[PDB]
Write a protein that binds this ligand. Sequence first.
Ligand code: ZKJ
Ligand code: ZN
Length: 198
Amino acid sequence: HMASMKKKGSVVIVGRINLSGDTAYAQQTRGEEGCQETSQTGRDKNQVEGEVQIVSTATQTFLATSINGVLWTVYHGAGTRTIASPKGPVTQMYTNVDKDLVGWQAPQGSRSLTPCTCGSSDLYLVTRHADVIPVRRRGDSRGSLLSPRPISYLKGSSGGPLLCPAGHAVGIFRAAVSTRGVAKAVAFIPVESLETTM
Ligand SMILES: COc1ccc2nc(C)c(O[C@@H]3C[C@H]4C(=O)N[C@]5(C(=O)NS(=O)(=O)C6(C)CC6)C[C@H]5/C=C\CCCCC[C@H](NC(=O)O[C@H](C)C(F)(F)F)C(=O)N4C3)nc2c1
Ligand SMILES: [Zn+2]
């Protein structure tokens, strides 16, 4: 009935991947109860820092990455959802199901990565566990893991960045290619396809 129709909650920032030092590590900034409440209200007054956020809905958790001033993630995680902010829910500024891509204005206090113009194929995937995984670029939207590992280790890291040697953003991780459960390659949205979208 129309009176009872519910609304999906917002995506919520629940942590970050700290890349500021010589050691990468995940930090949690909100626990599951606060996450649920913030998703319903859409009001998040927690201070945001850093480039790679850990984000959650009521049912899924993944990453989101700031590049020029946009917080980017995957459509298969966020759908068309708002993100929680200090002033309430914020509507997506980019949505592209064909790329598995969404974006919101980057939160106040975030730091943005710079889009790579190096043309390098020696990349680094950052996961939600703060693993920094070498990936050889193999095409516009694909790269191979130098050390394959079970897909379990990549689950929950969609929306994370592929970085070049200089720390610029080359892409947003979106899918893993596996054989017998071992991830041998990854697919990503290339930064140019974001720069086009922008
Ligand atoms: C609804 O509208 C949509 C529009 C476009 C769209 N486009 C893509 C490509 C898509 O793909 C889905 C979701 C991702 C995924 O699981 N994302 C990671 C992740 O971590 N998600 S997540 O954070 O856990 C989560 C679910 C919370 C958000 C990064 C994966 C980690 C481990 C793999 C686990 C087994 C899965 C292996 C899959 N392989 C694969 O499809 O490969 C083929 C050959 C491709 F062509 F894509 F390469 C895979 O990776 N998929 C399967 N769904 C959609 C949906
Ligand atoms: Zn670069």
